[PDB]
Design a protein around this nucleic acid. Sequence first.
RNA 1: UUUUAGUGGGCCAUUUUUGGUAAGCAGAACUGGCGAUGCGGGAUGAACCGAACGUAGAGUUAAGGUGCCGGAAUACACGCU
RNA 2: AUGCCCUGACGAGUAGGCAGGCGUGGAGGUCAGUGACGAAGCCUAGACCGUAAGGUCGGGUCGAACGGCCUCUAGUGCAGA
Lengths: 58, 222, 51, 185, 172, 159, 127
Amino acid sequence: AKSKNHTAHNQTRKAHRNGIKKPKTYKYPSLKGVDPKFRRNHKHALHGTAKALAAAKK
Amino acid sequence: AEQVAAERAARKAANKEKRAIILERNAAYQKEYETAERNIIQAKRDAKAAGSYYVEAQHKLVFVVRIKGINKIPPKPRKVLQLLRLTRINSGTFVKVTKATLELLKLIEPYVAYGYPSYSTIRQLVYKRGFGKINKQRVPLSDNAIIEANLGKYGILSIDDLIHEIITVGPHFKQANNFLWPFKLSNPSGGWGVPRKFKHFIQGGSFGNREEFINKLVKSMN
Amino acid sequence: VLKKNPLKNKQVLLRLNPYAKVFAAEKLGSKKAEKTGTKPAAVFTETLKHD
Amino acid sequence: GIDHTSKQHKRSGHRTAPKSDNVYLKLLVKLYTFLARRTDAPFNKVVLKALFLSKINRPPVSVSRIARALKQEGAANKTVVVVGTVTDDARIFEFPKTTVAALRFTAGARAKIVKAGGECITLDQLAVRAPKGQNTLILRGPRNSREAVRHFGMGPHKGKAPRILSTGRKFERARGRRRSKGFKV
Amino acid sequence: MAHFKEYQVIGRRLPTESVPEPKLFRMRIFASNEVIAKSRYWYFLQKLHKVKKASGEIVSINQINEAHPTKVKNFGVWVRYDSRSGTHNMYKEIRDVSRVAAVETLYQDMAARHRARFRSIHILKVAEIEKTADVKRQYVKQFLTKDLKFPLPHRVQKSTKTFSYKRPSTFY
Amino acid sequence: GKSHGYRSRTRYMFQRDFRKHGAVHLSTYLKVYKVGDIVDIKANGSIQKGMPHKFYQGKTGVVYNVTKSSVGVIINKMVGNRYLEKRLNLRVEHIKHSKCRQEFLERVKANAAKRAEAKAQGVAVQLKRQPAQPRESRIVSTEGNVPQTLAPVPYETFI
Amino acid sequence: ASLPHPKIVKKHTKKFKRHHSDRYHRVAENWRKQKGIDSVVRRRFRGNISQPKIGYGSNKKTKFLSPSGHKTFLVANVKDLETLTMHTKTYAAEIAHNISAKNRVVILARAKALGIKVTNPKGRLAL
RNA sequence: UUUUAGUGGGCCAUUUUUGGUAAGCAGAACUGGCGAUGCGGGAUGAACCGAACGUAGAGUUAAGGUGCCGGAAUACACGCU
RNA sequence: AUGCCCUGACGAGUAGGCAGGCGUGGAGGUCAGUGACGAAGCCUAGACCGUAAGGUCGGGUCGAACGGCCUCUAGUGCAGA
Ligand SMILES: [Mg+2]
Ligand SMILES: [Mg+2]
Ligand SMILES: [Mg+2]
Ligand SMILES: [Mg+2]
Ligand SMILES: [Mg+2]
Ligand SMILES: [Mg+2]
Ligand SMILES: [Mg+2]
Ligand SMILES: [Mg+2]
Ligand SMILES: [Mg+2]
Ligand SMILES: [Mg+2]
Ligand SMILES: [Mg+2]
Ligand SMILES: [Mg+2]
Ligand SMILES: [Mg+2]
Ligand SMILES: [Mg+2]
Ligand SMILES: [Mg+2]
Ligand SMILES: [Mg+2]
Ligand SMILES: [Mg+2]
Ligand SMILES: [Mg+2]
Ligand SMILES: [Mg+2]
Ligand SMILES: [Mg+2]
Ligand SMILES: [Mg+2]
Ligand SMILES: [Mg+2]
Ligand SMILES: [Mg+2]
Ligand SMILES: [Mg+2]
Ligand SMILES: [Mg+2]
Ligand SMILES: [Mg+2]
Ligand SMILES: [Mg+2]
Ligand SMILES: [Mg+2]
């Protein structure tokens, strides 16, 4: 049969019945997507920071 | 030896200085409302004598009554009315006039009657229709002790303190105005005037700004 | 249990606002104003009655 | 009519009583409802809520989890409180003398506590000897280590353990799991 | 519009740092209340000047009364209005004891005779015709003859009773 | 049939801003982007590599990754009933700093500075911004400025 | 008699009869909610019957009370009557429908001896 | 966070629209409705106006009206026909 | 003490979800339950309780069994096919 193809009528009512959320950011994002050279050094630049912190407290 | 009577002597003492504080602060407000209106009246007389035109201070407070019901409202004025706590017809709220609120009023203009409330209408609305939001729970004001329990940290201790923070837009206007649960007004007692409400007041309806004629309308709704 | 209206019921008008007694005493709501004799400028009334 | 901004007649979404018809657990709820009402210590409000919790919301706390919380700095003499079941652990070979207040102790975890000179205490004995939660330490077991949480949020590029009955070759290690057979997840 | 009131409105076009003391425009406005008169102020100055209410300022609104409200005046009212198919200028003469009560008649007359609403009409000018024989219209020149008197035939008396007993008369 | 390609409907958007065709001026390549900087995405049509999709033209986001010629920018994209984090690899010639964040950061330095002489004396310096408050009293003089305007004008066709 | 009580207000004394129970014999007057999609009863068209809803519920002070001010308690024998010795101002005995005529004599004698209002002291009396 | 029902035929109105001479036409966009909804008004009507609904009492209104049906001025005023 | 009480707000609704209840046949317990001085059924513009599902009582007919409550169970509720 002939049918109504497409409409976006009533689509923003459903989009706001459950209240659109911004994506809930965090401190310390994932290092996926970073330049792998920078992440590789950052493993060591934070390992040695912990060694210089844990030995200095004890 | 449960020792009530010394505590009742202390409580009835402490109520007496508290009413003494309220009585002198109401006398302080009563003199300052009187000199303020006398100064504005004399300033106009002085400017007319000195060939000039006294231009009044622009109004810092409006009182917004929602005059339209619930159905068929577009999404943008619907959200502004909720943020002004006008969630049903004939609800009222005082609104401090800034540019951020002068543009809220222009969005909801065909749903509200607003205008500039006088001391008398502020006094009568808070006396007759004044309620507090206390554990949200809508408490009628009815006693000065339940204002000081909730607004004493801003130095508001009586009902006439609360009117004073509304008419003179004080530094704690926001806390005093959001304390007041929105005024649940009746329909106006001599009707509206105006055979059709939902045109502008300028063209002969009710909505929008009726600058000082809000006092006739709200006292009819009170 | 029952909200009584100040602006009726003088007892609740005095429970709130102890100055309500003093306002009614000195009558304070029908108080006179001093009679000052300011007159407007000539340019004010001429501009008022201008065509 | 009212331009409502919120769903009318909404329940809280929180248990206010246990679903269990355990007669003695209602007595403990009765004991701690009184305490949370009348003491103003926050321990009794947390404990009374945790009495309401369901069986997966009360995971067991091992005795090796009890012992590891007593390795905390200055917490050796606190009273461990588990609103739930305390289970054994033979993976730990030394257990400290301590006071543990739980609902239930398994017959091995009662053995490993009283052999080290400890005491296994019911929560009504805890409220007698610590009505404000004085010097107590609440321990909670791991909720998300359950075998059912693994299948939650199973989707593309999620790594979340498909709901399956059969394990090994021929069972979901093919098209959709390797770049050779079709595509990868 | 129970009775129109004449106002003077004075507006300014807000002072800038380049221009302090701007030039103070004044209109004479026939309106019901001051809300409409200020609205009629900005509507008319927006046809004359680069100013609007968002960039302007009302510095005085004063109600102008009629100086001699108990003297019969011949007025000449200049009016521009929009019809259904164009804009027309118009001159009409109203004999009345007030300016604001001639403007009542004019808004009544233009609605009755030209179907022109309040929103269609601009009052160009009300002036009192000072001297007789400068009165142009004949419908008002009627009432300016020496020793004018007229009867009122066919008097119909209102009744408060639904029934009469007399078969009444219309003498007067 | 229907066409839904990558640069579809981008006829005027990727265009080159009349009398400013040609090479990219060198201040674009000398700008310095750090992680956390807030950047406006505007595609330069004369550079076809590293070019953002048409959805992101005019969007503003935060730098998260820095490579040789490209910043990694995070944009929030409304997808259905929620926003999803979009991570874009754009070369630095489609990218400029958001001038609002330079205006913010000076106000942070200003509010730090204004609170310093609030600590010398006179606490609660009232450093929050306020909207356009209503005007105060005026007294408008008339000396040399007597109020005058005439009436509305009549109807003339003036062709 | 009974305790003091407020005036008993019923809010709807009329029976809630089923739609079209007056019209077909197969439809009983026992209330059934019209679940039809077209139903002018269900859609609350003006002119139609009232439907039971919780706003009609009785005030809880006077709920379950007879007009005599008592809650009816159904009593089978003398022992069941004697659970009402202390509550003679709140409860009235109703002798059950299946009690013998000779057993109804013995119940009414004790309820007179105890001061209990029996709301049906006339079933199976030879008069 | 888990789990699950129904739905996946739509239709109308304002505004901006494509096609069509036009359509109670075929297709889009945004919103508000109807479907799923009674109540007061438009005589009558899914969609318009007003307003959304526990059971009652009192007051005041909306939109619409106030010769009579029909509650409410054969009101007041200026004209026009 | 899923009681007693104080306070505030709210109440539209198809498909649909859930909760609290009403009723039926049979089962475990109990009321040392009712019953040939009349069980059950049935009729009753007689009465009472419950918003309701329903429950209760009186009268007439009748003649052998049948209820309340705490639970278990299902071939468990009809206006339509
Ligand atoms: Mg479809
Ligand atoms: Mg009246
Ligand atoms: Mg294309
Ligand atoms: Mg009834
Ligand atoms: Mg009924
Ligand atoms: Mg039935
Ligand atoms: Mg239908
Ligand atoms: Mg489908
Ligand atoms: Mg279908
Ligand atoms: Mg076309
Ligand atoms: Mg329907
Ligand atoms: Mg209507
Ligand atoms: Mg209708
Ligand atoms: Mg019609
Ligand atoms: Mg009609
Ligand atoms: Mg009542
Ligand atoms: Mg009539
Ligand atoms: Mg409902
Ligand atoms: Mg129920
Ligand atoms: Mg059974
Ligand atoms: Mg027997
Ligand atoms: Mg029988
Ligand atoms: Mg019958
Ligand atoms: Mg037989
Ligand atoms: Mg069956
Ligand atoms: Mg049925
Ligand atoms: Mg049948
Ligand atoms: Mg059916």
